[model samples]
Target chain A: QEISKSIYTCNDNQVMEVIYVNTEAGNAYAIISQVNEMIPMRLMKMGANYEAIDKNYTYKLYTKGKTAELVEGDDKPVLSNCSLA
Target chain B: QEISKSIYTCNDNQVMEVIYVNTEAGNAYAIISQVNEMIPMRLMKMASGANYEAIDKNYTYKLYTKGKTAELVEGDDKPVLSNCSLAN
Candidate 1:
């Protein structure tokens, strides 16, 4: 397993540091830290997207690049253009 | 340009909520609220690793990766690892 960390900045001027634990199955564990909270999430490969869920939130990320989108209950994209650092 | 928010948990059970603001130059700002106080930071990409500096210049915060966990340091404080995930 190869684990790496990348930091990202968004339009709201916030910084997110993500630790990606890569595996052979194309699936991975993305450990994210924002503000002062840490969230350990699972990323499952779905074609070109990696999907994960947190409570009522859903995230669809790019498999090979930095593009993490958060979808709320209304199915509206709340967070976008979240690139890798 | 885009903005986003995400939450994280560390090894010592500290919760960090980070709001990320993105741009085209591969750089953005990060507003972090840890414990109860909030600190704004700027993340700059360097040759090897990401460089971070506090916006207000109050304390020093550094985040690094180690294997399956992420390490974080605030000011001259002790560093901690990400033992588990955030709250419910």
Candidate 2:
């Protein structure tokens, strides 16, 4: 299956690209990248949401149109003005 | 304050450098680098030791060191300092 990719511009003017690849079953794996981050995150779908996490941080992604919003674990919107780029 | 630096070779033959810079009071900050890492970690003193942490999809660094051995709690079970030695 072909993977889907989308790039967004964060409020800080940094770039975050989300790549979705079909995995087992009907779910997809989201590979996310940020310009300021050295490592990319691999998120798996849970119900209607996709989530990625590490020791100290969590990223929740929600889609809207051609854009998406990434929320931190603190319930703050880290990337609200995320637009397709 | 002057910064001190030391380099080491890991078991996989990768080079890692430890850079220490004097900070406020009697403490210091350690900046660690590895050939495979794109970002360096800045660590502060914790009780009797020093620690730093960072995470990604494939790698995580929960780094701790005293002066002789530096260990990352993640990755394969290989000893972080196994056959590792000082480099000029």
Candidate 3:
């Protein structure tokens, strides 16, 4: 159910917690914990990478191993170059 | 993101919040809020019914619109026959 739980520290000293979950049915998700909110994002696996997306909002999370990034509406990167903390 | 957010009051006056989610990939989930914890659970649809299951734990939530039930380990019903609570 739970694959990995990691806290990331990105550029500008911003921090967020990403909790990865892999269901038995092969469904993968990421629960983004930031600003006292827990947003569950579905994962879209890319070539050697992964992207977590929120359908009803403009919240997207991109990750590669321990590094990550978060973008909101208009491609605005709220978090960038984040690594495991 | 979020499909529906509802608070329910069960037998014995228990309270819980359910936040339904339907992703673009057709993946549906329910985020259960209870005791200051938020648990994300995947959906397992049944015949004209639905069950939200948490794989890592023994948490299972069954619901039909405003009516709902929650069971934890040992299939023990934590909340049963819960209906929408206008106020808790």
Taking chain B only, the TM-score of every model is: 0.62, 0.54, 0.57
lDDT: the better of candidates 1 and 2: 2
How well is each residue in A1-85 modelled by candidate 1, as lDDT tens digits? Answer: 1344566665566555555544443445555543335444566655244444355435444534565554334546545566666
Give the 10-residue window scoring lowest on summed lDDT in candidate 2 chain A: A33-42
> What does TM-score give for chain A of every model?
0.58, 0.65, 0.79
lDDT tens digits, residue span A1-85, model 3: 3344567788986776665655555666766654445566776655223343446666788777667788887769888998888
What order do you get sorting by lDDT, best first?
3, 2, 1
lDDT of 3 by residue, B1-88 (tens): 3344555565566655565666445666666543334556666666444566654464554444423544322145544445444344
DockQ of 1: 0.07
Summed backbone clashes in each candidate are 33, 0, 0
Candidate 3 positional error at B3, Å = 10
Per TM-score, the best of the predicted structures is 3
Deviation from native of the Cα of residue A49 in model 3, angstroms: 6.3
Global lDDT for candidate 3? 0.58
Q: Report the lDDT tens digits of candidate 2 across residue range B31-73.
A: 4434333323445446556665442334455567656656655
Q: Is candidate 1 or candidate 2 better by DockQ?
A: 1
Clashing pairs in 2: none
Measured with C-alpha atoms, the lDDT of residue B33 in candidate 1 is: 46
